[PDB]
Amino acid sequence: MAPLQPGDSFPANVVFSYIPPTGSLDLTVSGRPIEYNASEALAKGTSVLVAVPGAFTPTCQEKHVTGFIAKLDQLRQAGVDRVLFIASNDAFVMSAWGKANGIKDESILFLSDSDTAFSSSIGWANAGRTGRYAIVVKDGKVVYAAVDTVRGSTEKSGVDAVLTVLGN
Amino acid sequence: APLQPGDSFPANVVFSYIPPTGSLDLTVSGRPIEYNASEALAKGTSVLVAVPGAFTPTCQEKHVTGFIAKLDQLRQAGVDRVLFIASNDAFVMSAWGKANGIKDESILFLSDSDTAFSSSIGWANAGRTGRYAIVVKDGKVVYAAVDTVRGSTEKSGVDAVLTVLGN
Numbered sequence A: 001m002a003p004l005q006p007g008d009s010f011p012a013n014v015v016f017s018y019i020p021p022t023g024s025l026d027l028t029v030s031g032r033p034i035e036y037n038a039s040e041a042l043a044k045g046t047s048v049l050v051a052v053p054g055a056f057t058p059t060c061q062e063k064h065v066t067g068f069i070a071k072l073d074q075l076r077q078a079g080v081d082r083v084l085f086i087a088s089n090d091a092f093v094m095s096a097w098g099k100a101n102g103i104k105d106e107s108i109l110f111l112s113d114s115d116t117a118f119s120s121s122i123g124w125a126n127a128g129r130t131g132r133y134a135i136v137v138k139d140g141k142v143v144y145a146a147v148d149t150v151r152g153s154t155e156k157s158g159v160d161a162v163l164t165v166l167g168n
Numbered sequence B: 001a002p003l004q005p006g007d008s009f010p011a012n013v014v015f016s017y018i019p020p021t022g023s024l025d026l027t028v029s030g031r032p033i034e035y036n037a038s039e040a041l042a043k044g045t046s047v048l049v050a051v052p053g054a055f056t057p058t059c060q061e062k063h064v065t066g067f068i069a070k071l072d073q074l075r076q077a078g079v080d081r082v083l084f085i086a087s088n089d090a091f092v093m094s095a096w097g098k099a100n101g102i103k104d105e106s107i108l109f110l111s112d113s114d115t116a117f118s119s120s121i122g123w124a125n126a127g128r129t130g131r132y133a134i135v136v137k138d139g140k141v142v143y144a145a146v147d148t149v150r151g152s153t154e155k156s157g158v159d160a161v162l163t164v165l166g167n
Helices: A058-070 A072-077 A091-100 A114-121 A159-167 B057-069 B071-076 B090-099 B113-120 B158-166
Strands: A015-018 A034-037 A046-051 A082-087 A109-112 A132-138 A141-148 B014-017 B033-036 B045-050 B081-086 B108-111 B131-137 B140-147
Touching: A015 A091, A015 A114, A046 A058, A058 A072, A058 A082, A058 A132, A058 A159, A072 A159, A082 A091, A091 A109, A091 B090, A132 A159, A141 A159, B014 B090, B014 B113, B045 B057, B057 B071, B057 B081, B057 B131, B057 B158, B071 B158, B081 B090, B090 B108, B131 B158, B140 B158
Parallel strands: A046 A082, A082 A109, B045 B081, B081 B108
Antiparallel strands: A015 A034, A015 A109, A046 A132, A132 A141, B014 B033, B014 B108, B045 B131, B131 B140
């Protein structure tokens, strides 16, 4: 299928699995997963959805999520209402990944694209992992969608690319 | 082939893992290598525990924590190495070990990539390993058992392993 383009509607009926943040960073509490209605959340306001190949893996952790965390204030000033990080890791691993990064609240949500269903549906999954990509949505419409295919690069899906889009 | 007491531990069993560096900081990822489990298990007393998933409720809150709480007793019972495996990748397994305060070789946290080993002994399910424990002495299986009851560590928990070792 053709990748998402600016002006496309964000796909309907997209649901992720996640553990909402409790405020505790205690990694030894597994938590309770529920679902997240991504299509509904993205229908209003400005959203940034970032997919990473794997929680805790080197680029995803040391460059990609850390870049977003470092510029959360700039994202908020740019009008972003929600930031979602997804991967194929299960909700328990994703919750731990957020806690390991000090995220106690909803500033970034960490969710599972179970079995890569959503990422596969938009052509950006590989053998059980999602690609590395970012989608910016406003009021249910794609503003930007791009995937990084160069190993270790966040040129297209990193926080700076997203901030550039929002400033234009 | 279901492993049972008296069998040789299978050959060519290799896991993927990040050897512990001493770090307890989950934000540093590490470099994975392979672990030759068949060779490590050929000498001494080994406990190999498989869990369905790093960070999941029973695996975290009951199974690995039970083993950590009684590492002193496992040592005194003659255990030379404890290995925890799951289908999660080596980066997740390393983070899971660090989340439990393990910074050395007291318990190693390794990936059974694609459930290769667990499938070969009949104890894997839909991309996850089963919950099981294998005790090995000098290359020979002395105990091998799987828990199939949801939330149970009756057969693969530390108390079952300590009982095995005491008999």
